[PDB]
Swiss-Prot record, chain B:
Protein name as annotated: 8-amino-7-oxononanoate synthase
Residues annotated with N6-(pyridoxal phosphate)lysine modification: 230
Reactions this protein catalyses: 6-carboxyhexanoyl-[ACP] + L-alanine + H(+) = (8S)-8-amino-7-oxononanoate + holo-[ACP] + CO2
Gene: bioF
The protein's role, per its UniProt record: Catalyzes the decarboxylative condensation of pimeloyl-[acyl-carrier protein] and L-alanine to produce 8-amino-7-oxononanoate (AON), [acyl-carrier protein], and carbon dioxide.
Binding site for pyridoxal 5'-phosphate: 99-100, 170, 195-198, 227-230
Annotated keywords: Acyltransferase, Biotin biosynthesis, Pyridoxal phosphate, Transferase
Gene Ontology BP, a term: biotin biosynthetic process
Residues binding substrate, per UniProt: 21, 124, 340
Keyword presence, ATP-binding: no
Length: 378, 377
């Protein structure tokens, strides 16, 4: 009877189901029956033939895994060729790929802050960045959403020499845009570093999909470090940290989620290298995902044009919000559903994620389904 | 200029002390005999493993497309999880993007505030990071000290307690006293969490891990973590245990929910490797044999219990020189110095692989005998 030490998991499940928060998995078949407006495969590249070719060619050339840490034997010519390709596309001096976006965020923020330093964090930050702040062992100040003045005051009063301001370029919570130039003006005045996660800007912002930093003209600044994922626009798996040449050499030397991980599979690096090749050659994809989002905003009754791929549809009640998500699926459309604790109380919503590859008949099914489901929920 | 100019001062201090890491670049045709990778079964470049990855890539695409809690959970993910749990003798399995996020997700989600973690002093970095993230009260126990764990559990004020250890420790390659530890957890009502990244494919008569080997597979009070990137030649992590544990991690583990979920190519690769190991249990026995063979070469007196042989040189610069003299003669070996290993214990690491041939061993015998006899004069 080793029942006691795991019996508390049952009480947590009762309480989670009591508040209607218990998350479960659905299982997706290879040929999907239902239109997907819930993934973050923004450019449709996960199943593009070129992307299939890149992963397979890497896989046959290099194997199924890196074989070990990049600090021992896992660093291939493929890894460094992609790092050059990504950095050049993004306008950065250097790039370093991690096994995932989550470990890229842990690795970058922890190694550039650390004990005795200050981190200024946005209150709506992605969980990967909140965990990083906990792991850095730095002193952490959390500012109101996109409150540049709050950032200014926190930096001006710090006794710590080194400070990192952390933010998303395109926020995963709401899809709004970070005030990158203002935030950066505050950092340089205070000698602080600016860390920017462009997981939702890459492939989406910029006229050629190069991210919000590039778009606002901050790409390559000596005091800006960028993180991104390879699993959204670039259709693959992995994380990446980008910035000055010294940052890469620092992460190799001290970032714990880089040294003591096995490092990104070749097939994922090959896949993402092809996907970046397609984006570079078909930059209209970054514009189509923004266009489809706008149509999704109009459909959903959102009056202001979306600046990012994902549309938020504030239903305002959790059971109503979940109810709408379930009715869409039954009608052939898989949509995203955020309820507390993900969003504040009373702001339960659907997320409609645009993809560059959406066709006109698929949008008419989105018009048909979302209109009917939302008009009932309304 | 200001906020990153401090990195140059860190580069000066690190390089002056000879600890500065750099990344070397590997060609598709390796130039050297490789004794530093943890591809224990040689399955990363195996034809079936390559096929399983290519087939997963063509059927499903290059990535999962999102977190498994939204649209990334494929039939392939859940088929490999069933395949793995059956092989391991566990009730359930859940695969992560890496062994590192598996360790964060399982330990943090099963401890949390108001709980107690008893951690082994030689714990892997992914385990150290988890304790920092759990916000539990963390007691670090002396290495494999069952009595200290018992006393720590006996005096605690927290109702829920997790004793965390690796089955095969990454530091030294020794084995955890799992049967003794589990009796103590049972006496005090604690959960036993075991990271089997270096036991999978290595311990057990069929490579099923140390937990399986000692007869503790499937226990209601044992949670297991492992990686898919060592023996199974791929990418990913996995947490295994009772069904309620999988359901809990899906519901609360942040490094599961808010990561994108393992690429199909990695799952297909790993499912193919698990098939070859299942069909070739001799691959597990062979890595211990090759390790023993490497131990005799190196002058190590006790037979290895894991794949990687430690060769203690007690001098940092000597260890660095020995690895360089090995590399220059065509052999890649591991090189560890403080603060990575304890002070006074700078060493080489020689990782055995099931796919090592007797001719590669003859080159290791000649080069290691020559370098080591020079380094221990």
């Amino acid at each position: 009877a080793g029942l006691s030490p795991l019996a508390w998991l049952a009480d947590i499940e009762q309480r989670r189901r009591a508040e209607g928060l218990r998350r479960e998995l659905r299982v997706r078949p290879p040929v999907a029956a239902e239109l997907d407006l819930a993934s973050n495969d923004y450019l449709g590249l996960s199943q593009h033939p070129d992307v299939l070719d890149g992963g397979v060619e890497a896989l046959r050339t290099w194997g199924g895994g890196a074989g070990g840490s990049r600090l021992v034997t896992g660093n291939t010519e493929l890894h460094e060729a992609f790092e050059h390709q990504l950095a050049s596309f993004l306008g950065a001096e250097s790039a370093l790929v991690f096994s995932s976006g989550y470990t890229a965020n842990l690795g970058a923020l922890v190694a550039l802050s650390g004990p005795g330093s200050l981190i200024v964090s946005d209150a709506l930050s992605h969980a990967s960045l909140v965990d990083a702040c906990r792991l850095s062992r730095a002193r952490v100040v959390v500012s109101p959403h996109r409150d540049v003045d709050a950032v200014d005051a926190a930096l001006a009063a710090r006794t710590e020499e080194r400070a990192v301001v952390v933010t998303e370029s395109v926020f995963s919570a709401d899809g709004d845009l970070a005030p990158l130039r203002d935030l950066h003006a505050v950092c340089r005045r205070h000698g602080a570093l600016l860390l920017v996660d462009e997981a939702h800007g890459l492939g989406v912002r910029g006229t050629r999909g190069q991210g919000l930093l590039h778009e606002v003209g901050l790409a390559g600044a000596p005091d800006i470090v960028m993180t991104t994922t390879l699993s959204k626009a670039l259709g693959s798996q992995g994380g990446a940290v980008l910035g000055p040449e010294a940052v890469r050499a620092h992460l190799i030397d001290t970032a714990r989620s880089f040294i003591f991980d096995t490092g990104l599979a070749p097939a994922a690096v090959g896949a993402a290298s092809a996907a970046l090749r397609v984006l570079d050659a078909e930059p209209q994809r970054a514009r189509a995902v923004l266009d489809r989002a706008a149509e999704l905003a109009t459909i959903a009754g959102v009056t202001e044009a979306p600046v990012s791929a994902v549309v938020s549809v504030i239903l305002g009640d959790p059971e109503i919000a979940v109810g709408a998500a379930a009715a869409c699926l039954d009608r052939g459309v898989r949509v995203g559903c955020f309820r507390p604790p993900t969003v504040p109380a009373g702001t339960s919503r659907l997320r409609l994620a645009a993809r560059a590859s959406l066709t006109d008949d698929e949008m008419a099914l989105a018009r048909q389904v979302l209109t009917d489901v939302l008009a009932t929920a309304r």
